[PDB]
Design a binder for this molecule. Structure first.
Ligand SMILES: Nc1ncnc2c1ncn2[C@@H]1O[C@H](COP(=O)(O)OP(=O)(O)O)[C@@H](O)[C@H]1O
Lengths: 83, 47, 344, 62, 98, 320, 119, 51
C-alpha cells in the first residue's frame, strides 16, 4: 500500500544509511537461501586433505578404489573442474 | 457506597468460569489416570 | 528502568544457576556464577542512594575474587589430570580453595561479614534474591562434588557459621540483617551435612527458600525494615500476625512446625555417622536462633506495641497482597512436618 | 470386642514393628559397605563417558 | 613448563595477597583483580596449548570476555562512587554498618 | 488491570495523553485570602478539574460512603479546639498538623493518578510544600517542642522528594492587619481569638524559605489581593508561563510508571508517615488504639475490603 | 545418591517403571490432609486481603484444594517408587553378597546370662 | 426453618463416628495373627471369623 511506500521513500532520503544496513542485513541472509552454489561451500571444503587419508586393508569386500588410485572408482571429484 | 469505585465491583466472570473449568479437568484427569493405573497395576504384575 | 532491560536481566539471573545446573565442565559451571553476579549489580542500584553504591562494591570485590579463586582450581585441575571436572583424585588444597571461595560466595566462618551488610542498605526485592536463588548456583557447583571435600574444615565452617550466624542475630534490630544472619545459621545445616547424604541439604534449601520469601513478601507489604516499624502491625494488618508467628517459630525449628525437620533429620545422619560431640553444639546454639525470634515475636503479636496516630489513615486504603505466593508457601511450611516421609 | 482381638492385634504390630528395626540396621550397614567398596548401584559417582571420543585416525601414534 | 607455572602461581598468589590488602583505594584493588585474571589466563593458555588441546582452546576467550565484562561494571561503580564523594578512597564508605 | 506493567507495554502511556493544560497547579495565601473564588473559576476558565483544601477528614471523605467520621477515627485534631487553647500537654498543635500533612500528601497523591490518566491539570490549594509555613510561626511562638518539629521535616525529607513539584504555584500576599479583620467579617468564633502575631509570623517565615526555594523548581506568580478579584488576567498569565526550570522535562515516560505505581498504592505512599518514632504527643498506646480499630471495623461499611460488604451493597460477596 | 544407578531415566518424574506399583488410595492421612491444607490456604489469603473469611472466593478455595491434591497424588506416586527402589536395590545387594550378612540371631534366654543388677 | 443458626451440633458427633470408623479401618489393616496366637489358637464352630 501507499502507507508503507511513503515511509520507504521518506525514511530513505532522511536516513539513507541504515537502509543499506537493514537491507544488507536481511539481504545477506536471503541470498544463501536461494543460491545453487551454496552446496559447494562444504563439498570443496570437505574434499581438502589437510590430513593424510589413512588406508584400509583388503578383506575381500568394499568394492571401492584399488591400491593404485588411478581407477575412476571412489570420489574422483571432477565436478570441481568445469565448476 | 464506595466512592472510590473498587476494582472488584462485578465478578471477574472471565476467570471464575475459567478456573472451575480447570479444576474439573484437574479432577477428571486425576481419576481416569488413577483407574487406568489400578487397571494397569493388575495386568502389569499378575493381578 | 525499561521492560526491555528488565526481562533481559531477570533472564540472566535465571541463566546463571541453570547454566551452572545444566552443564558438566567447571567452566560453564563458572560463568553461571557471573550471570548470577552481573545481573545483581543493576538492581542493587536503582534508588542510587549511597547505601546501594557501597553494597555493590562491597559485594562485587567479595564476589569476584571468589570467582577467580574458583577459576584457579579448574586450571590447576586442567593441569593436574587434564580435563574440566573434579574427577576423584584431585589434591585437597585445590578444593580447599574451591570450598574457600564458595564460602565467600555465601558467607560462613569469617566470610559472612559482608552478606548482611549488603542485605542492609537495599530494597527487599533484590534482597530476596541474594538468599534464595543466587544461593543455588554456588551449591550447583557443589552437589557435583558429593564426596571428597575435606570433611575436617567443612565442619569448621558450619559451627563458626552457626555461632556467628546466631550471635550476630541477637544484637540487630533491622529485619534485613536478621533474615540475613539466619541465612548463615541455616547454612551450616545446609553445609555440615553436605558429604553425609546431600539430598538432605537440597531440602533445607527448598525449605529455607519457603521460609524467607513469605517473610520478605510480608515486609514488602508494608516496607518495614525494623522491629519497631513492624511491631505496629496490629494496627496495620492484625491478620498477618498468625503466619509471621508460625513462620518464625517454624524457621527456628520447633517440632510441630516443619523447620524442625531439617534440623532433626540432619542430626539423624550425623549421629548415625559417629559425631556425637559436634552436632550437639549446633542444635544447642540453634536455640539461640530462637531468642531473637522469640524476642521478635514479643514485639509482633504477643503484646501490641504502641503505634502512630498517623496510621489511622492507613486503615482506609484497601491493601493488596499477592496470591499463590505467601499463603501457598506459608502453609507448605508451618503445617507440613507430618509429610516428612514424602519430603524425604 | 475383646482381648482375643487385642492380644492378637498387638502381635500384629510387633511383626510389623520389630521387622523395621532389622531393616534399618541392615539398610545402614548396606549403606556403609556400598560406599567403601562401591559395588552396588548406590554411590556410583560419575565418570566421563566413552562416547565422546573419536576412535578415528588423527596422526601417527596418538 | 613447571619453571613457569609455580612462578605464575606465585605471581597469582601475590595478586591475591594483593587484593586483600588495601592502601586507600578501590581501583588498585579493582586493578590487581586482573593480574589475578591474567595469571589465570596464561596458565590456561599454556596447558590447553602444551597439551595440544585445541578443543579446549576456545575457553581462554570465553574467560577473557568475562575477564572484562565483570571488570567493566567494576569500573562503572567507581564513577558512582566518585560522583558521590569524588575521592575514590576505600575508607570513605563505612555506612552500611548501622 | 490496575495499570500493572503490561498496560505500559500494551499502551497506557502518559505523554500520549498530555496537554498544554495537563498542568498541576496550586494556590497559596493565608487563612482567609482568596482560594475559594480563585481556585474554582480557574479549572473552569481552562478546562481541567479542581480539588479543595485538605480538611482534617479528606481521607474519610474519599473512601467507603465518602462520609466523615468521629474525631478519634480521624486523628484527634479538633481545629475548633486548637485556637481557643493550645499549650496543653494534651498535644494538639502537632497532631493537628501531621494528620493534615499526610492528607495534603494524599490529596497531592490523588491528583497524580488523574494527572497521569486522562491528563488534565489539577487545581490544588495550599499544597504540601507550603505546610511548614504553619509550623515555623507555630514554633517561633510557644506551641510545640523543638524535638517534635524534627519529626516533621524528617518525614518531609522522606516523602517530599519522591514526588514532583507543584508546577507553577501562586501566592497572594496580603497585609496581616487586614486578614485578622476578614476573620471578624466571617461568622466564626473559633478563628477569632487567634494571636495576630501568629498571622504575622505566618508569612514572614513564608517568603524567606518557601518563596525563594520554589522560584527555582517552579515559577511563582506573586499577586496582591486587589490584583486578584479578576481571574481573567491570571488565566492568561498562565498561558505565557513558559514551562522550564523544573524536573518535569528530564524524565521519560518510564519514570511516570514507577511514579504511578508508587501513587496508586495509597498505602505505599504513607509507609514513612507511620514510622515507629515515639513521641508522647502522638504516640497513643495500645488499648486506646485497639479499641478504635476494633470499633472501627465494626463500623457499618468497612469490616472487610471495600469490595465485600453486604451492608452497603456488594451482592456477589462470594466470588468477585 | 540414588541418581547414578543403572535403570535410570534422568529427569523422568514418573519413570514409566513405577507403573507396576499400587497407586494411592485417594483417601489417606496425607492427601486428605493436603486437601484440608489447601482449604487452610484460601482461608488465609482472604484473611490477609481483609476479605470475608470462610467465603469470598468459593473458586479460589476449590483451586487450592485441588491444585495441591492433584500435585500430592503424583508426588506420592513418585516417592512410593523411591522407597520401593530403596528396598529393591537393598535386598538384591544382599543376595549377591550373602557372605557378609549372616543370621545367627541369638540363643534363647537359657544358654545365656545377663548380670542381674538387682535394684 | 431458617438459616440454620444452630447446625454445628451435628458437627462433632460426625467425628466420633468417623473416628470409630478410622479406629476400625486400623483394625482390618492389621488383621493378622487372627487366630495364630499360641494363647487362643481355638478353631471355631463351623463359622468364619473372630475379631
Ligand atoms: N494547620 C492549620 N492550622 C490552622 N488553620 C488551618 C490549618 N490547616 C487548614 N487551616 C484552615 O484552612 C482554612 C482555609 O480557609 P480560607 O482561606 O477562608 O478559604 P480556603 O479554604 O479557600 O483557603 C483557614 O481558615 C485555616 O485556618
Amino acid at each position: 500500500a501507499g502507507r508503507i511506500s511513503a515511509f520507504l521513500k521518506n525514511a530513505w532520503a532522511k536516513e539513507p544509511v541504515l537502509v543499506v544496513s537493514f537491507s544488507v542485513w536481511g539481504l545477506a541472509i536471503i541470498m544463501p537461501m536461494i543460491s545453487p552454489y551454496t552446496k559447494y561451500a562444504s563439498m570443496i571444503n570437505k574434499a581438502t586433505p589437510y590430513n593424510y587419508p589413512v588406508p584400509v586393508r583388503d578383506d575381500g569386500n568394499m568394492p571401492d578404489v584399488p591400491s593404485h588410485p588411478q581407477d575412476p572408482l571412489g570420489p574422483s571429484l571432477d565436478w570441481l573442474k568445469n565448476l | 457506597f464506595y466512592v472510590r469505585e473498587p476494582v472488584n465491583a462485578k465478578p471477574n466472570w472471565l476467570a471464575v468460569g475459567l478456573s472451575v473449568g480447570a479444576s474439573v479437568f484437574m479432577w477428571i484427569y486425576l481419576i481416569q489416570t488413577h483407574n487406568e493405573d489400578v487397571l494397569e497395576y493388575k495386568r502389569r504384575n499378575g493381578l | 528502568m525499561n521492560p526491555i532491560t528488565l526481562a533481559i536481566i531477570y533472564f540472566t539471573i535465571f541463566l546463571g544457576p541453570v547454566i551452572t545446573m545444566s552443564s558438566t565442565n567447571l567452566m560453564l559451571m563458572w560463568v553461571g556464577l557471573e550471570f548470577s553476579l552481573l545481573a545483581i549489580i543493576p538492581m542493587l542500584i536503582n534508588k542510587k542512594n549511597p547505601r546501594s553504591t557501597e553494597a555493590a562494591t562491597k559485594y562485587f570485590v567479595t564476589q569476584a575474587t571468589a570467582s577467580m579463586i574458583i577459576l584457579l582450581a579448574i586450571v590447576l585441575n586442567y593441569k593436574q589430570l587434564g580435563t574440566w571436572m573434579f574427577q576423584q583424585q584431585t589434591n585437597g588444597l585445590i578444593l580447599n580453595m574451591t570450598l574457600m571461595a564458595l564460602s565467600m560466595k555465601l558467607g560462613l566462618a569469617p566470610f559472612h561479614f559482608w552478606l548482611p551488610e549488603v542485605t542492609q542498605g537495599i530494597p527487599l526485592h533484590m534482597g530476596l534474591i541474594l538468599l534464595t536463588w543466587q544461593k543455588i548456583a554456588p551449591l550447583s557447583i557443589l552437589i557435583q562434588i558429593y564426596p571428597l571435600l575435606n570433611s575436617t574444615i567443612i565442619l569448621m565452617l558450619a559451627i563458626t557459621s552457626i555461632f556467628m550466624g546466631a550471635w550476630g542475630g541477637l544484637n540487630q534490630t533491622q529485619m534485613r540483617k536478621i533474615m540475613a544472619y539466619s541465612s548463615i545459621a541455616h547454612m551450616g545445616w545446609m553445609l555440615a551435612i553436605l558429604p553425609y547424604n546431600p539430598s538432605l541439604t537440597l531440602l533445607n534449601l527448598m525449605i529455607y527458600i519457603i521460609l524467607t520469601a513469605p517473610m520478605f513478601m510480608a515486609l514488602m507489604l508494608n516496607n518495614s525494615m525494623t522491629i519497631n516499624s513492624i511491631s505496629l502491625l496490629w494496627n496495620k494488618t492484625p491478620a498477618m500476625l498468625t503466619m509471621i508467628s508460625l513462620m518464625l517459630l517454624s524457621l527456628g525449628g520447633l517440632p510441630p512446625l516443619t523447620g524442625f525437620l531439617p534440623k532433626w533429620i540432619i542430626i539423624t545422619e550425623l549421629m548415625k555417622n559417629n559425631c556425637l560431640i559436634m552436632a550437639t553444639l549446633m542444635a544447642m546454639m540453634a536455640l539461640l536462633n530462637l531468642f531473637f525470634y522469640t524476642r521478635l515475636i514479643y514485639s509482633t503479636s504477643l503484646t501490641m506495641f504502641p503505634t502512630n496516630n498517623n496510621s489511622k489513615m492507613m486503615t482506609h486504603q484497601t491493601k493488596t497482597k499477592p496470591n499463590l505466593m505467601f499463603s501457598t508457601l506459608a502453609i507448605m511450611s508451618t503445617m507440613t512436618l507430618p509429610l516428612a516421609p514424602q519430603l524425604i | 470386642d475383646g482381648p482375643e482381638k487385642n492380644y492378637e492385634k498387638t502381635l500384629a504390630i510387633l511383626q510389623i514393628e520389630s521387622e523395621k528395626a532389622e531393616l534399618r540396621l541392615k539398610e545402614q550397614e548396606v549403606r556403609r559397605l556400598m560406599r567403601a567398596r562401591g559395588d552396588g548401584p548406590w554411590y556410583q559417582f560419575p565418570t566421563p563417558e566413552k562416547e565422546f571420543i573419536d576412535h578415528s585416525p588423527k596422526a601417527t601414534p596418538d | 613448563m613447571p619453571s613457569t607455572f609455580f612462578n605464575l602461581t606465585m605471581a597469582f598468589s601475590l595478586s591475591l595477597l594483593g587484593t586483600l590488602m588495601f592502601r586507600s583505594h578501590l581501583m588498585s584493588t579493582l586493578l590487581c583483580l586482573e593480574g589475578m585474571v591474567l595469571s589465570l589466563f596464561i596458565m590456561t593458555s599454556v596447558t590447553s596449548l602444551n597439551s595440544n588441546s585445541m578443543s579446549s582452546m576456545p575457553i581462554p576467550i570465553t574467560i577473557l570476555v568475562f575477564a572484562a565484562c565483570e571488570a567493566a561494571v567494576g569500573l562503572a561503580l567507581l564513577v558512582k562512587v566518585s560522583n558521590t564523594y569524588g575521592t575514590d578512597y576505600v575508607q570513605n564508605l563505612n555506612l552500611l554498618q548501622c | 488491570l490496575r495499570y500493572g506493567l503490561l498496560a505500559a507495554i500494551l499502551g497506557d502511556k502518559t505523554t500520549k495523553k498530555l496537554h498544554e493544560y495537563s498542568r498541576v497547579i496550586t494556590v497559596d495565601g493565608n487563612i482567609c485570602s482568596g482560594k475559594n473564588k480563585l481556585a474554582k473559576e480557574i479549572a473552569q476558565q481552562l478546562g481541567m478539574k479542581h480539588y479543595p483544601e485538605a480538611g482534617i477528614q479528606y481521607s474519610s471523605t474519599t473512601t467507603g460512603d465518602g462520609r466523615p467520621l468521629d474525631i478519634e477515627f480521624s486523628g484527634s485534631c479538633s481545629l475548633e479546639k486548637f485556637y481557643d487553647d493550645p499549650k496543653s500537654n494534651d498535644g494538639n498543635s502537632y497532631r493537628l498538623q501531621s494528620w493534615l500533612y499526610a492528607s495534603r500528601l494524599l490529596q497531592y497523591a490523588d491528583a497524580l493518578e488523574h494527572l497521569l490518566s486522562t491528563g488534565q491539570g489539577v487545581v490544588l490549594e495550599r499544597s504540601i510544600y507550603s505546610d511548614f509555613v504553619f509550623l515555623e510561626a507555630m514554633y517561633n511562638q510557644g506551641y510545640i517542642r523543638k524535638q517534635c518539629v524534627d519529626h516533621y521535616n524528617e518525614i518531609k525529607r522522606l516523602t517530599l522528594p519522591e514526588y514532583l513539584p507543584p508546577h507553577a504555584v501562586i501566592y497572594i500576599d496580603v497585609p496581616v492587619p487586614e486578614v485578622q479583620s476578614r476573620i471578624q467579617k466571617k461568622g466564626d468564633p473559633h478563628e477569632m481569638k487567634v494571636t495576630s502575631a501568629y498571622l504575622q509570623d505566618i508569612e514572614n517565615a513564608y517568603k524567606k524559605t518557601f518563596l525563594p526555594k520554589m522560584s527555582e523548581m517552579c515559577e511563582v506568580l506573586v499577586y496582591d489581593s486587589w490584583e486578584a478579584e479578576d481571574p481573567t488576567k491570571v488565566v492568561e498569565d498562565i498561558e505565557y508561563l513558559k514551562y522550564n526550570k523544573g524536573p518535569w522535562l528530564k524524565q521519560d515516560d518510564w519514570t511516570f510508571h514507577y511514579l504511578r505505581m508508587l501513587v496508586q498504592d495509597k498505602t505505599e505512599v504513607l509507609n514513612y508517615t507511620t514510622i515507629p518514632v515515639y513521641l508522647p504527643e502522638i504516640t497513643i498506646g495500645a488499648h486506646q488504639g485497639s479499641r478504635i480499630y476494633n470499633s472501627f471495623r465494626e463500623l457499618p461499611g468497612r469490616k472487610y475490603a471495600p469490595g465485600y460488604n453486604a451492608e452497603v451493597g456488594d451482592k456477589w460477596i462470594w466470588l468477585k | 545418591m540414588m541418581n547414578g544407578r543403572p535403570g535410570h531415566e534422568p529427569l523422568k518424574f514418573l519413570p514409566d517403571e513405577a507403573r507396576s506399583l499400587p497407586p494411592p488410595k485417594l483417601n489417606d492421612p496425607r492427601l486428605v490432609y493436603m486437601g484440608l491444607l489447601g482449604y487452610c490456604t484460601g482461608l488465609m489469603d482472604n484473611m490477609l486481603r481483609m476479605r470475608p473469611v470462610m467465603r469470598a472466593g468459593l473458586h479460589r478455595q476449590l483451586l487450592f484444594v485441588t491444585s495441591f491434591v492433584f500435585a500430592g497424588y503424583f508426588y506420592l506416586k513418585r516417592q512410593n517408587y523411591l522407597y520401593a527402589v530403596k528396598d529393591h536395590d537393598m535386598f538384591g545387594y544382599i543376595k549377591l553378597h550373602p557372605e557378609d550378612f549372616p543370621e545367627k540371631e541369638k540363643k534363647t534366654y537359657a544358654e545365656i546370662l545377663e548380670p542381674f543388677h538387682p535394684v | 426453618q431458617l438459616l440454620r443458626e444452630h447446625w454445628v451440633h451435628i458437627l462433632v458427633p460426625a467425628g466420633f463416628v468417623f473416628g470409630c470408623y478410622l479406629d476400625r479401618k486400623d483394625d482390618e489393616k492389621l488383621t493378622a495373627f487372627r487366630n495364630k496366637s499360641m494363647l487362643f489358637q481355638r478353631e471355631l464352630r463351623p463359622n468364619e471369623e473372630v475379631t
